Design an enzyme around this catalytic site. Structure first.
Site, PDB file in Angstrom:
ATOM      1  N   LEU B 126       0.596  -1.032   0.108  1.00 17.82           N
ATOM      2  CA  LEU B 126       0.181   0.477  -0.026  1.00 17.82           C
ATOM      3  C   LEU B 126       1.403   1.224   0.091  1.00 17.82           C
ATOM      4  N   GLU B 128       3.818   3.916  -0.541  1.00 16.78           N
ATOM      5  CA  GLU B 128       4.435   4.730  -2.001  1.00 16.78           C
ATOM      6  C   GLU B 128       5.573   5.348  -1.298  1.00 16.78           C
ATOM      7  N   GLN B 280      17.457  -0.320  45.123  1.00 18.40           N
ATOM      8  CA  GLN B 280      16.581   0.117  44.909  1.00 18.40           C
ATOM      9  C   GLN B 280      16.604   0.613  43.704  1.00 18.40           C
ATOM     10  N   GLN B 337      20.024   0.028  30.734  1.00 20.73           N
ATOM     11  CA  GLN B 337      20.580   0.261  31.986  1.00 20.73           C
ATOM     12  C   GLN B 337      21.105   0.109  33.125  1.00 20.73           C
ATOM     13  N   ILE B 338      20.564  -1.156  33.372  1.00 23.74           N
ATOM     14  CA  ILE B 338      20.787  -2.400  34.155  1.00 23.74           C
ATOM     15  C   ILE B 338      21.872  -3.597  34.153  1.00 23.74           C
ATOM     16  N   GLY B 340      24.175  -1.799  32.785  1.00 23.92           N
ATOM     17  CA  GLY B 340      26.177  -1.591  32.742  1.00 23.92           C
ATOM     18  C   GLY B 340      26.243  -1.267  31.530  1.00 23.92           C
ATOM     19  N   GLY B 341      27.582  -0.964  31.090  1.00 18.45           N
ATOM     20  CA  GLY B 341      28.327  -0.999  30.186  1.00 18.45           C
ATOM     21  C   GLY B 341      28.139  -2.241  29.441  1.00 18.45           C
ATOM     22  N   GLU B 364       2.376   0.263  11.220  1.00 18.83           N
ATOM     23  CA  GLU B 364       1.248  -0.382  11.640  1.00 18.83           C
ATOM     24  C   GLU B 364       0.005   0.382  12.299  1.00 18.83           C
ATOM     25  N   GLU B 368       0.711   8.733  16.164  1.00 22.23           N
ATOM     26  CA  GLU B 368       0.304  10.148  16.182  1.00 22.23           C
ATOM     27  C   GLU B 368      -1.499   9.146  15.073  1.00 22.23           C
TER      28      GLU B 368
HETATM   29  C1  FDA Z   1      32.271   2.341  25.466  1.00 22.52           C
HETATM   30  C2  FDA Z   1      32.547   1.926  26.766  1.00 22.52           C
HETATM   31  C3  FDA Z   1      33.668   2.632  27.436  1.00 22.52           C
HETATM   32  C4  FDA Z   1      33.995   2.674  28.605  1.00 22.52           C
HETATM   33  C5  FDA Z   1      33.625   2.026  29.593  1.00 22.52           C
HETATM   34  C6  FDA Z   1      32.307   1.506  29.311  1.00 22.52           C
HETATM   35  C7  FDA Z   1      31.061   0.760  27.658  1.00 22.52           C
HETATM   36  C8  FDA Z   1      30.918   0.338  27.649  1.00 22.52           C
HETATM   37  N1  FDA Z   1      33.960   2.160  30.892  1.00 22.52           N
HETATM   38  C9  FDA Z   1      33.133   1.615  31.713  1.00 22.52           C
HETATM   39  C10 FDA Z   1      32.486   2.402  32.127  1.00 22.52           C
HETATM   40  O1  FDA Z   1      33.049   3.017  32.872  1.00 22.52           O
HETATM   41  C11 FDA Z   1      31.123   1.216  33.419  1.00 22.52           C
HETATM   42  O2  FDA Z   1      30.575   0.293  32.269  1.00 22.52           O
HETATM   43  C12 FDA Z   1      30.408   1.780  33.710  1.00 22.52           C
HETATM   44  O3  FDA Z   1      30.842   2.571  35.157  1.00 22.52           O
HETATM   45  C13 FDA Z   1      29.246   0.922  34.778  1.00 22.52           C
HETATM   46  O4  FDA Z   1      30.227  -0.242  34.895  1.00 22.52           O
HETATM   47  P1  FDA Z   1      29.681  -1.761  34.457  1.00 22.52           P
HETATM   48  O5  FDA Z   1      29.368  -1.772  33.700  1.00 22.52           O
HETATM   49  O6  FDA Z   1      30.843  -2.388  34.833  1.00 22.52           O
HETATM   50  O7  FDA Z   1      28.065  -1.948  35.313  1.00 22.52           O
HETATM   51  P2  FDA Z   1      28.230  -1.823  37.245  1.00 22.52           P
HETATM   52  O8  FDA Z   1      27.727  -3.342  37.253  1.00 22.52           O
HETATM   53  O9  FDA Z   1      29.040  -0.779  37.767  1.00 22.52           O
HETATM   54  O10 FDA Z   1      26.134  -1.527  36.766  1.00 22.52           O
HETATM   55  C14 FDA Z   1      25.202  -2.106  36.830  1.00 22.52           C
HETATM   56  C15 FDA Z   1      24.283  -1.283  36.991  1.00 22.52           C
HETATM   57  O11 FDA Z   1      23.532  -1.242  38.274  1.00 22.52           O
HETATM   58  C16 FDA Z   1      23.627  -0.455  38.834  1.00 22.52           C
HETATM   59  N2  FDA Z   1      24.326   0.170  39.775  1.00 22.52           N
HETATM   60  C17 FDA Z   1      25.653  -0.535  40.017  1.00 22.52           C
HETATM   61  N3  FDA Z   1      25.944   0.333  41.512  1.00 22.52           N
HETATM   62  C18 FDA Z   1      24.561   0.097  41.816  1.00 22.52           C
HETATM   63  C19 FDA Z   1      23.749   1.218  43.574  1.00 22.52           C
HETATM   64  N4  FDA Z   1      24.927   1.362  44.693  1.00 22.52           N
HETATM   65  N5  FDA Z   1      23.054   1.943  43.512  1.00 22.52           N
HETATM   66  C20 FDA Z   1      21.977   1.789  42.246  1.00 22.52           C
HETATM   67  N6  FDA Z   1      22.195   1.568  40.996  1.00 22.52           N
HETATM   68  C21 FDA Z   1      23.632   0.391  40.962  1.00 22.52           C
HETATM   69  C22 FDA Z   1      24.021   1.204  37.755  1.00 22.52           C
HETATM   70  O12 FDA Z   1      23.572   2.449  37.833  1.00 22.52           O
HETATM   71  C23 FDA Z   1      24.150   0.027  36.349  1.00 22.52           C
HETATM   72  O13 FDA Z   1      22.491   0.636  35.719  1.00 22.52           O
HETATM   73  C24 FDA Z   1      35.841   2.534  30.663  1.00 22.52           C
HETATM   74  N7  FDA Z   1      35.781   2.730  31.734  1.00 22.52           N
HETATM   75  C25 FDA Z   1      37.496   2.694  31.539  1.00 22.52           C
HETATM   76  O14 FDA Z   1      38.626   2.286  33.198  1.00 22.52           O
HETATM   77  N8  FDA Z   1      38.162   2.764  31.023  1.00 22.52           N
HETATM   78  C26 FDA Z   1      37.648   3.107  30.148  1.00 22.52           C
HETATM   79  O15 FDA Z   1      37.783   4.140  28.574  1.00 22.52           O
HETATM   80  C27 FDA Z   1      35.912   3.442  29.403  1.00 22.52           C
HETATM   81  N9  FDA Z   1      35.197   4.100  28.528  1.00 22.52           N
HETATM   82  C1  FDA Z   2      10.040  -1.749   8.590  1.00 19.24           C
HETATM   83  C2  FDA Z   2       8.811  -1.278   7.805  1.00 19.24           C
HETATM   84  C3  FDA Z   2       8.171  -2.369   7.379  1.00 19.24           C
HETATM   85  C4  FDA Z   2       6.725  -1.980   6.679  1.00 19.24           C
HETATM   86  C5  FDA Z   2       6.706  -0.566   7.373  1.00 19.24           C
HETATM   87  C6  FDA Z   2       7.589   0.074   7.381  1.00 19.24           C
HETATM   88  C7  FDA Z   2       8.762   0.056   7.530  1.00 19.24           C
HETATM   89  C8  FDA Z   2       9.840   1.165   8.772  1.00 19.24           C
HETATM   90  N1  FDA Z   2       5.245  -0.197   5.353  1.00 19.24           N
HETATM   91  C9  FDA Z   2       5.055   1.801   5.848  1.00 19.24           C
HETATM   92  C10 FDA Z   2       4.813   2.482   7.031  1.00 19.24           C
HETATM   93  O1  FDA Z   2       3.369   1.780   7.333  1.00 19.24           O
HETATM   94  C11 FDA Z   2       4.907   3.561   7.558  1.00 19.24           C
HETATM   95  O2  FDA Z   2       6.322   3.778   7.184  1.00 19.24           O
HETATM   96  C12 FDA Z   2       4.137   4.654   8.200  1.00 19.24           C
HETATM   97  O3  FDA Z   2       2.532   4.730   7.719  1.00 19.24           O
HETATM   98  C13 FDA Z   2       4.333   5.779   8.112  1.00 19.24           C
HETATM   99  O4  FDA Z   2       4.424   6.531   7.069  1.00 19.24           O
HETATM  100  P1  FDA Z   2       6.105   7.018   6.226  1.00 19.24           P
HETATM  101  O5  FDA Z   2       7.020   6.341   6.732  1.00 19.24           O
HETATM  102  O6  FDA Z   2       5.525   7.656   5.225  1.00 19.24           O
HETATM  103  O7  FDA Z   2       6.470   8.337   7.366  1.00 19.24           O
HETATM  104  P2  FDA Z   2       4.453   9.762   6.949  1.00 19.24           P
HETATM  105  O8  FDA Z   2       5.559  10.979   6.400  1.00 19.24           O
HETATM  106  O9  FDA Z   2       3.796   8.679   7.273  1.00 19.24           O
HETATM  107  O10 FDA Z   2       5.417  10.221   9.061  1.00 19.24           O
HETATM  108  C14 FDA Z   2       6.044  10.449   9.177  1.00 19.24           C
HETATM  109  C15 FDA Z   2       6.081  11.317  10.771  1.00 19.24           C
HETATM  110  O11 FDA Z   2       4.766  12.699  10.261  1.00 19.24           O
HETATM  111  C16 FDA Z   2       3.943  12.147  11.337  1.00 19.24           C
HETATM  112  N2  FDA Z   2       2.591  12.560  10.227  1.00 19.24           N
HETATM  113  C17 FDA Z   2       2.226  12.909   9.304  1.00 19.24           C
HETATM  114  N3  FDA Z   2       1.093  12.907   9.160  1.00 19.24           N
HETATM  115  C18 FDA Z   2       0.978  13.748  10.520  1.00 19.24           C
HETATM  116  C19 FDA Z   2      -0.411  14.363  11.095  1.00 19.24           C
HETATM  117  N4  FDA Z   2      -1.673  14.610   9.555  1.00 19.24           N
HETATM  118  N5  FDA Z   2      -0.695  14.716  11.853  1.00 19.24           N
HETATM  119  C20 FDA Z   2       0.610  14.811  12.905  1.00 19.24           C
HETATM  120  N6  FDA Z   2       1.742  13.717  12.523  1.00 19.24           N
HETATM  121  C21 FDA Z   2       1.707  13.701  11.479  1.00 19.24           C
HETATM  122  C22 FDA Z   2       3.450  10.669  11.402  1.00 19.24           C
HETATM  123  O12 FDA Z   2       3.383  10.129  12.525  1.00 19.24           O
HETATM  124  C23 FDA Z   2       5.004  10.653  11.442  1.00 19.24           C
HETATM  125  O13 FDA Z   2       5.933  10.617  12.651  1.00 19.24           O
HETATM  126  C24 FDA Z   2       4.438  -0.881   5.015  1.00 19.24           C
HETATM  127  N7  FDA Z   2       3.431  -0.271   4.528  1.00 19.24           N
HETATM  128  C25 FDA Z   2       3.050  -1.411   4.032  1.00 19.24           C
HETATM  129  O14 FDA Z   2       2.395  -1.128   2.716  1.00 19.24           O
HETATM  130  N8  FDA Z   2       3.799  -2.714   3.370  1.00 19.24           N
HETATM  131  C26 FDA Z   2       3.956  -2.874   4.048  1.00 19.24           C
HETATM  132  O15 FDA Z   2       4.477  -4.484   4.148  1.00 19.24           O
HETATM  133  C27 FDA Z   2       4.773  -1.932   5.531  1.00 19.24           C
HETATM  134  N9  FDA Z   2       5.506  -2.487   6.400  1.00 19.24           N
END
Ligand code: FDA
Ligand code: FDA
Lengths: 378, 378
Positions: B126, B128, B280, B337-338, B340-341, B364, B368
């Site tokens: 449907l 386009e 918590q 988030q849970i 972490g990294g 689907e 909006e």
């Molecule tokens: C791409 C990329 C790049 C880097 C890094 C990560 C990633 C993904 N970091 C590591 C990064 O700093 C690290 O992921 C975060 O400190 C989170 O720690 P963990 O991944 O161990 O999750 P962790 O186990 O610490 O946390 C898991 C979840 O539990 C939550 N949580 C933990 N303790 C809690 C508490 N007491 N209360 C409530 N919530 C708690 C956290 O908020 C998190 O949502 C890093 N490090 C480094 O040394 N050098 C670097 O260069 C980088 N760069």
């Molecule tokens: C992976 C995948 C798979 C499918 C499809 C998409 C994708 C990404 N769809 C197409 C899909 O249904 C379509 O992307 C949505 O209808 C949104 O339309 P557009 O992509 O044209 O964005 P469009 O231009 O409609 O919307 C852009 C933004 O503007 C907003 N907007 C538009 N009009 C508005 C109004 N009057 N008021 C407020 N906000 C408005 C929308 O909410 C949206 O956020 C499809 N179709 C199909 O025929 N057969 C299929 O099998 C599939 N399957």
């Protein structure tokens, strides 16, 4: 937009960073994401342009002016490529920072100029498989044997792990002293025993090399101790403000890039007889995106001015990082939504922004840790 | 959990769908995401198991019992692999549906049994390039020339575009009649002129083939008109309830898979001296995830019971779809988030859930459009 609030230098730095991003980052970000690789030549250009020395004083070979200019340069870089921004933030704040804060004249002389120019990229190795947020619970050890610090253990998630020339490494030297038994070390990344694993496969910032590193009798000279023995934890916490200001700005820049694509798309995409920017629901989203982006910028710049003046700013930097990171996921999600089905396609790039943004709530202290820090100081 | 509220058949269908997902989908979802491809053998298994005939009456070769069982089967499939769920939802609701609703005995005889068993996968064409949400503004045309319907134009985002054996295609037949000038057509996908482009590159459900299709003098027999001439729009809207119930359930299943990984990880990952499930902030997230998942399921099942009894349920199905899709992004974000990294690493799989979930707010009917529909019926 905000420009009359900026000095001429700040504006000049912002303009140069943007021109570089527009020309050298934005056209290639999609390719680097696909390759999961950042060309060495781009890193070297960030170096030449002074973007990798923005925390180091000019008299020591850097380009420091103030932290506002750094925050502005970081936002523009992130808007061009998020992976470059990660590289840049980590290198500036936790590569150069600790050497600047705690290095001896000999160590500063060997390293600072080169790092500030980006000839030597820095990595920071604190996190371990079992220890992230609880960063003081360390199990990598360093023992002084035969006039050498010999390191053994494992670090996780090392940003710049493949490209780094030097690593700031945190290891337990005096177990019985707990949190006061950790020390910091400068470790040339070509030292035998410094074993860098494959980059991790990540949802986004895929071009920022993020590697596990293993230390197997990694032997360095005795003088590669950074700071005093036992001072390791202090040193690991000594650049949190710069680190958070940088990632906050990265979040801001990514959100902004996605917002700019969405506004553009909205003014050009017609649906139900009008550009979609004119539908209330899109207007509302765009308004909210602008508000959050501007509020985030102001939070970041506030923390940056405080830091420039040497004033206490841990809370303020953590607020910026928390707010900018959580809003960036929302702004990027709305950016996708504004594009409709095109938002989910790799070709429209807002999906990459959404993927890249998500990491900013996790590293540089999780959102949970940011909240603890802000609350504890009320 | 909710089981005493289900009939024995519903429980049996749920159990068989889960065993299949656990054994055949969940271990391979990561591979299919990486390959951006769903094996033909898995599709054929969904067929054998009756999951691709769940809207077609048993006497016509299907496996229809009630819409609750369909919603339950869809949640379990999505929890195993989101791309399979997309394939399944589209095939059931807008592949089989329109033939069941509007096909002649000859057309039903040729197609229904095969589609219901998954020997022939259906696509629905449907949208386009210029027309998505405004689905009645069509420019693909069909003109009756030499005893043949000859189609010319372009369709965008065709789910099942490569693997489909038959396409339900909507084209303008009588321009001067506007919305009442569209007609529906059955188009074997091997018909000369039916030109399927490369699958689109997408952020997630990457293994669900999503293709542009071009129609260049695509000639089919005159009797491949589905319904009456001019009835095309009605037919395109005739299965919105099933379509939305299905994608709502897909959103639910994806969220649930991510939640199950997060609860597991939380009970095993120790940080600051306790499993993180005991902090918590994690408790709070887990509680909120469960609430939203359960509320979404109840919304879905409510719409499904109404539909089973032939009662009006457009609003109720659109509520389910809206709520389930928006909550699934939140649940999946917290799941990341849970961890972490680790949440950001491809190996931990919650990042794939987050990527896959995001499409459910768009197709689907965008969120909006769901809001418009729910409000207009108050
Ligand atoms: C791409 C990329 C790049 C880097 C890094 C990560 C990633 C993904 N970091 C590591 C990064 O700093 C690290 O992921 C975060 O400190 C989170 O720690 P963990 O991944 O161990 O999750 P962790 O186990 O610490 O946390 C898991 C979840 O539990 C939550 N949580 C933990 N303790 C809690 C508490 N007491 N209360 C409530 N919530 C708690 C956290 O908020 C998190 O949502 C890093 N490090 C480094 O040394 N050098 C670097 O260069 C980088 N760069
Ligand atoms: C992976 C995948 C798979 C499918 C499809 C998409 C994708 C990404 N769809 C197409 C899909 O249904 C379509 O992307 C949505 O209808 C949104 O339309 P557009 O992509 O044209 O964005 P469009 O231009 O409609 O919307 C852009 C933004 O503007 C907003 N907007 C538009 N009009 C508005 C109004 N009057 N008021 C407020 N906000 C408005 C929308 O909410 C949206 O956020 C499809 N179709 C199909 O025929 N057969 C299929 O099998 C599939 N399957």
């Amino acid at each position: 937009h905000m420009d009359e609030l900026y000095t001429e230098d700040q504006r000049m730095i912002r303009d140069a960073a943007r021109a570089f991003a527009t020309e050298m980052l934005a056209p290639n970000a999609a390719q680097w994401d696909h390759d999961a690789h950042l060309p060495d030549a781009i890193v070297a250009q960030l170096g030449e342009l002074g973007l990798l020395g923005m925390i180091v004083p000019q008299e020591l070979g850097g380009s420091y002016t103030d932290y506002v200019a750094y925050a502005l340069a970081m936002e523009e870089v992130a808007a061009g490529d998020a992976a470059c921004a990660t590289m840049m933030s980590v290198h500036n704040s936790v590569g150069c920072g600790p050497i600047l804060g705690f290095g001896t004249p000999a160590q500063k002389d060997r390293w600072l100029a080169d790092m500030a120019a980006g000839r030597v990229i820095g990595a920071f190795c604190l996190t371990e498989p079992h220890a992230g947020s609880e960063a003081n619970n360390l199990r990598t050890r360093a023992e002084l044997r035969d006039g050498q610090w010999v390191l053994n253990g494992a670090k996780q998630f090392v940003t710049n792990g493949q490209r780094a020339g030097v690593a700031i490494v945190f290891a337990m030297t005096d177990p019985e002293a707990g949190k006061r038994g950790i020390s910091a070390f400068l470790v040339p990344t070509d030292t035998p025993g410094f074993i860098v694993g494959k980059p991790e496969k990540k949802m986004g910032i895929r071009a920022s090399d993020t590697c596990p590193i293993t230390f197997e009798n990694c032997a360095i000279p005795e003088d590669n101790l950074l700071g005093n023995r036992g001072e390791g934890l202090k040193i690991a916490l000594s650049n949190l403000e710069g680190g958070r200001i940088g990632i906050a700005a990265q979040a801001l820049g990514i959100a902004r890039a996605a917002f700019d694509k969405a506004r553009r798309y909205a003014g050009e995409r017609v649906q139900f007889g009008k550009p979609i920017a004119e539908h209330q629901a899109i207007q509302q989203k765009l308004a909210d995106m602008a508000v959050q982006i501007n509020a985030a910028r102001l939070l970041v710049h506030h923390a940056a001015k405080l830091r420039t003046a040497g004033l206490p700013c841990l809370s303020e930097a953590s607020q910026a990082k928390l707010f900018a990171s959580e809003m960036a996921e929302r702004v990027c999600s709305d950016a996708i939504q504004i594009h409709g089905g095109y938002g989910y396609l790799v070709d429209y790039e807002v999906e990459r922004h959404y993927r890249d943004a998500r990491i900013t709530q996790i590293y540089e202290g999780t959102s949970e840790v940011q909240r603890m820090v802000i609350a504890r100081q009320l």
